[model samples]
Target: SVNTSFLSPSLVTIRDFDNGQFAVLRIGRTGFPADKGDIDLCLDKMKGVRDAQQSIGDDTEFGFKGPHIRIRCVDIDDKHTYNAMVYVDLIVGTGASEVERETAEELAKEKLRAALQVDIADEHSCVTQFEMKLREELLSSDSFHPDKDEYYKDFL
Candidate 1:
């Protein structure tokens, strides 16, 4: 049961390693708090996502050495109607400047919203919470037991 739903053009383009561009991580919602494809597409079309399989925690090594997007889904607000409330960000910029670095931060957030605007989730808008996921939230809330994140993170 290969769900082509994750093959959405936008999803493919961002994760495509040939572009020498951004690194994208997306989790689609096939169901609900239990969305299936949410985790399925994670491995779909992954090109250079793991080129540097040894240095896993270092996200900058995902694709090309440039801007990256950090994304997550779900909120306690209203109905989580947009299948999955995927959130993304430029997770690579040098963490400083306190201001200018923040510039890319804003851009990274909006670009996905704009991209997803034309995505399968057309009704997507104002995914406004911009929830800065915890180190563990990358995979799930409790998947990590202590001071680490995903298995990918803690394992690294």
Candidate 2:
């Protein structure tokens, strides 16, 4: 079971997941008074879920364990106009093919843009649209592997 003690309606600032890609949001407040460690504990529960699982819905049907994600707060932007904020960085080993890597990167970026509410901009929306189109194209190709290639090799 996920240790969901840290979860609260107020704790999550932004969360984006698409087709198993995971993207954590930048948490913020008027003065950003929350403990950093506590905030991290909340985000840690989300790491390693299968990309196909939706974060906002019931996900128990999927198995409980997977890869691990370690995140660190690189900086706090107290000077931002809206609120005091902290941004995180995560290193994920996503896949075994170049196309898969590209898909993951694009999906992450698209999710971030949406979470940040920057997708409304023409340029950013274009980028997101392009990413989706490219991902679709790659998936339609014969060489695409949704899971890491090594996991599927034995079956093929």
Top candidate by lDDT: 1
The collision pairs in model 1 are 69-89, 70-88, 70-89, 71-87, 71-88, 72-87, 73-85
- Candidate 1: misplaced stretches above 4 Å? 1-65, 71-82, 118-156
lDDT of 2 at 66: 16
Q: Please report how far candidate 1 places residue 111 from its true position, in Å.
A: 0.8
The lowest-lDDT stretch of 10 consecutive residues in candidate 1 is 147-156
Clashes found in each candidate (C-alpha, N, C closer than 3 A) = 7, 3
lDDT of 1 by residue, 39-100 (tens): 33333212212332112234434333333443322221224443334333234334335565
Which ranges in model 2 have alpha carbons more than 4 Å from their true place? Answer: 1-75, 83-95, 119-156
lDDT value for model 2 = 0.30
TM-score (all chains, Cα) for each model = 0.35, 0.30
What lDDT does the true structure give each of the candidates? 0.32, 0.30
Count clashing residue pairs in model 2.
Answer: 3
